[PDB]
Design a protein around this ligand. Structure first.
Ligand code: A1AM3
Ligand code: ZN
Length: 139
């Protein structure tokens, strides 16, 4: 679990979105596994605006942060999970690293701020859902 809190927005994995998130829907994209919901308390988080391919993610299954090299956001085939059938996830970045389903919501961050959130895994790669392209989160 976990989310990004920036201005009056809450960013979560779409598949982990609560009733409250959907009642306060701002934007969702199923192919990205993201949902943004409106918040009544302001958010302090800084979103990275950059094309960094290095940083650090939180791994709740290890209670520890890991430094990684990651791919640029892309269209990667992702196997069926429970929450989705097999489909092309968009804006996905991969790193060689440990993750399990409950690690979703873990933040990936670089020196510029939040890059994205853990979204999928398998075969020893962690996938993160990129948020740096959503310039509207910083208004
Ligand atoms: C973020 N994330 C989703 C799946 C995953 N790792 C693959 C996996 C699936 C089920 C049990 C154990 C490991 N990491
Ligand atoms: Zn950066």
């Amino acid at each position: 679990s976990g989310a990004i809190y920036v201005g009056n927005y809450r960013v979560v994995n779409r598949h982990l979105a609560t009733h409250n998130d959907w009642a306060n829907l701002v934007w969702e994209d199923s192919s990205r596994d993201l949902l943004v919901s409106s918040t009544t308390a302001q958010g302090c988080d800084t979103i990275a605006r950059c094309d960094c391919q290095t940083g650090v993610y939180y791994c709740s299954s290890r209670r520890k942060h890991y430094p990684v090299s990651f791919s640029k956001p892309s269209l990667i085939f992702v196997e069926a999970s429970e929450y989705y059938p097999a489909r092309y996830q968009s804006h996905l970045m991969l790193a060689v690293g440990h993750s399990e389903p409950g690690d979703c919501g873990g933040i990936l961050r670089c020196q510029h701020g939040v890059v994205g959130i853990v979204s999928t895994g398998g075969n020893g790669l962690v996938g993160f859902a990129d948020v740096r392209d959503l310039l509207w989160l910083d208004e």
